[PDB]
Amino acid sequence: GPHSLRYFVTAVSRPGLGEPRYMEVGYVDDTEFVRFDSDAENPRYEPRARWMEQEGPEYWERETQKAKGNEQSFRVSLRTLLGYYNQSAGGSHTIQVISGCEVGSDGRLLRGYQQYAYDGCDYIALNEDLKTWTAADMAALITKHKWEQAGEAERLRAYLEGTCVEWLRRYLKNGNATLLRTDSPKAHVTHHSRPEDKVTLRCWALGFYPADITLTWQLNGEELIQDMELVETRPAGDGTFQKWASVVVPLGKEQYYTCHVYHQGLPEPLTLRW
Amino acid sequence: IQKTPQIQVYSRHPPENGKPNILNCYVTQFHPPHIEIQMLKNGKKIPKVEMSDMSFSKDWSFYILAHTEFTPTETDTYACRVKHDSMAEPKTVYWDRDM
Amino acid sequence: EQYKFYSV
Numbered sequence: 303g304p305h306s307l308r309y310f311v312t313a314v315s316r317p318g319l320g321e322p323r324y325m326e327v328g329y330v331d332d333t334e335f336v337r338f339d340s341d342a343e344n345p346r347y348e349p350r351a352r353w354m355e356q357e358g359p360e361y362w363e364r365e366t367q368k369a370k371g372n373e374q375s376f377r378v379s380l381r382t383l384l385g386y387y388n389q390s391a392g393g394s395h396t397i398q399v400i401s402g403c404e405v406g407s408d409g410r411l412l413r414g415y416q417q418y419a420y421d422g423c424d425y426i427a428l429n430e431d432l433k434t435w436t437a438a439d440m441a442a443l444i445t446k447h448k449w450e451q452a453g454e455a456e457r458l459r460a461y462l463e464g465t466c467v468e469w470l471r472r473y474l475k476n477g478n479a480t481l482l483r484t485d486s487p488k489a490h491v492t493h494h495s496r497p498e499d500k501v502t503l504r505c506w507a508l509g510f511y512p513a514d515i516t517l518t519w520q521l522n523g524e525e526l527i528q529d530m531e532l533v534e535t536r537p538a539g540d541g542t543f544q545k546w547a548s549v550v551v552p553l554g555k556e557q558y559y560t561c562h563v564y565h566q567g568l569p570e571p572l573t574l575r576w
Numbered sequence: 577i578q579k580t581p582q583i584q585v586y587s588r589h590p591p592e593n594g595k596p597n598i599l600n601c602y603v604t605q606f607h608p609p610h611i612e613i614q615m616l617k618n619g620k621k622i623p624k625v626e627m628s629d630m631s632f633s634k635d636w637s638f639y640i641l642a643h644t645e646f647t648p649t650e651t652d653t654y655a656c657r658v659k660h661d662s663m664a665e666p667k668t669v670y671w672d673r674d675m
Numbered sequence: 676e677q678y679k680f681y682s683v
């Protein structure tokens with residue numbers, strides 16, 4: 303299926319406490335594989351997935367140097383934004399960026415993207431065509447004009463169609479045993495009492511990969527999607543994911559509800575009852 | 577943009593006393609990013625906690641995971657204490673093995 | 676690999 307290379311970058315100022323904290327976390331699909339944290343003793347880009355051991359020492363030196371340069375770039379961005387927004391230098395502010403590309407099953411580019419946020423709100427984003435930016439406000443419009451005159455769109459587009467795609471292919475190749483695998487979810491249902499003379503039924507799905515999955519509760523063959531509760535799919539510490547979905551049903555009527563689990567590792571969807 | 581974090585505590589495998597497992601504390605949907613997270617065993621901070629899977633959703637709120645290896649016992653209790661500006665005092669959420 | 680950014 304399709305795959306993605308994504309980088310989450312965060313820069314947070316902290317007046318009176320020194321320089322901004324700068325962090326970079328990279329993911330190949332839903333798997334973390336690289337990281338940089340300026341708050342480390344000896345800040346360096348480091349592997350987060352076993353297969354990254356296949357990259358030589360120069361990879362780490364190169365990326366470490368790149369990270370240090372980005373940190374400085376964002377530190378200046380933080381300062382610049384105080385000017386655009388005319389804000390005081392005594393407050394903490396945050397800049398966020400998602401940058402990445404996605405390829406199809408054949409390793410061919412499907413889409414590229416890079417979006418910014420300042421203090422939790424859209425700032426500037428590259429359009430689908432990878433040729434122009436769209437600014438959320440007048441501050442971002444200034445950035446848009448600067449970047450346009452600097453030819454940034456062209457430089458970013460070259461990265462997204464080239465560098466980004468080429469390295470993603472390499473990452474998928476080197477870590478194929480990890481990234482191309484499929485772990486089937488194991489499911490079970492828990493039961494809990496309620497005051498109102500009814501019960502809570504919770505469907506659990508464990509140890510699966512990739513992260514995408516669907517959990518539903520059915521009655522009379524129809525999905526109760528609406529009246530149920532759930533949590534977002536979450537990592538379980540070993541590279542796999544888990545999720546749960548619950549529904550409140552009338553005591554004694556439990557056997558009338560069934561849980562459905564759809565996943566890449568489930569040839570036929572799982573159906574469970576309590 | 578200030579959002580209170582959702583705190584979820586769970587094990588990798590269904591718990592079984594005496595068997596190695598992994599305890600997770602996923603802190604999500606929060607903003608600003610500054611935050612303190614501690615995993616506890618019987619009210620005491622666990623030393624070897626690993627931080628990972630840091631990211632943010634489309635609405636820009638942050639997500640991060642704290643996890644450690646552990647061997648469940650019938651009476652040992654586990655919890656995750658979180659400190660965020662959206663709250664005056666630290667919030668401690670327990671691991672509910674029966675959930 | 677990561678992209679090389681320049682200030683906003």
Ligand SMILES: *[C@@H]1O[C@H](CO[C@@H]2O[C@@H](C)[C@@H](O)[C@@H](O)[C@@H]2O)[C@@H](O[C@@H]2O[C@H](CO)[C@@H](O)[C@H](O)[C@H]2NC(C)=O)[C@H](O)[C@H]1NC(C)=O
Nearest residue numbers: 353356357472473474475476477478479480481482483484
């Ligand atoms: C994953 O791919 C390897 C192919 O070679 C890999 O190349 C490296 C970049 C790195 O990704 C390493 O994993 C490997 O060195 C597969 O290994 C080969 O498998 C074939 C069968 O298709 C076998 O005949 C060869 O002997 C293997 N070659 C080597 C050099 O080991 C490996 O099986 C793949 N694993 C999975 C789960 O798909």
Ligand SMILES: *[C@@H]1O[C@H](CO)[C@@H](O)[C@H](O)[C@H]1NC(C)=O
Nearest residue numbers: 384385386387388389390391
């Ligand atoms: C910037 O904000 C200050 C108030 O903190 C105000 O005095 C000043 O006029 C503002 N400048 C502009 C250009 O809006």
